Amino acid sequence: KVFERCELARTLKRLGMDGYRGISLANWMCLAKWESGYNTRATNYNAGDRSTEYGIFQINSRYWCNDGKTPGAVNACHLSCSALLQDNIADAVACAKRVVRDPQGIRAWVAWRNRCQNRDVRQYVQGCGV
Template sequence: MKTFFILSALLAVASPYVYEKCELARVLRNNGLDGFHGYSLANWVCLIQYESSYNTRAIGRNSRAGQIVSSDYGIFQINSYWWCDDGQTQNSRNGCRRSCDDYINDNIADDIQCAKSVVSDPQGMNAWYGWKNNCKIRNLDNFLRECNL
């Protein structure tokens, strides 16, 4: 029984928080992303849908020739080569000056600040393949209709 309790406690701590779309839209709007650098709130939510499926602790690995070259962290999938330091990616630029571990918890305030830096870069939202391949080409006028924002 004691082992079960400890295992349950560990699983509870390690469980990610997965936002609902409208809940996330409200958080992003309240943190100044609606219209930031000309991108609508729908673009931000769509980006997150395709990058992390609204999961605050998502981690993606990027490989070339079978070798991991960088990783993406958190709800925005912040890249370890360009934007954060994971201690594993060679020659990390660490543009947001933070550890990648900062982006895989349920507090997304620092994730939002880094995402603002990413989108302020000349590539804008094209820095995210999830947005470029799934949202950029779509009419997002009705994407958040059910959210009553």
């Protein structure tokens, strides 16, 4: 599903993402934006190391979800990577909360450092009533 900006802001808010581990909703929105353009069906295969990134947060198959074909997969979210391509993002949010309980937090996604860190990210939630 491709979410509309404020539709996604209110969904994340309902799912308990605002302020989760010190992370504002705006920061999670900036991350979904640049990772998938708010598209749950997004996949990016990385030929170099044989892993694939899945869904709205581009969660990788080496560490977080299991897809059967990635060498050295850990599957820390204990989730099939298939669960991250649903239109319902409850599973994707549960696994994104798992990622940020590690010390690196949101810095785990390089796209957040490039595109969101030390920038004004208030635009992403502006007018959504969140």
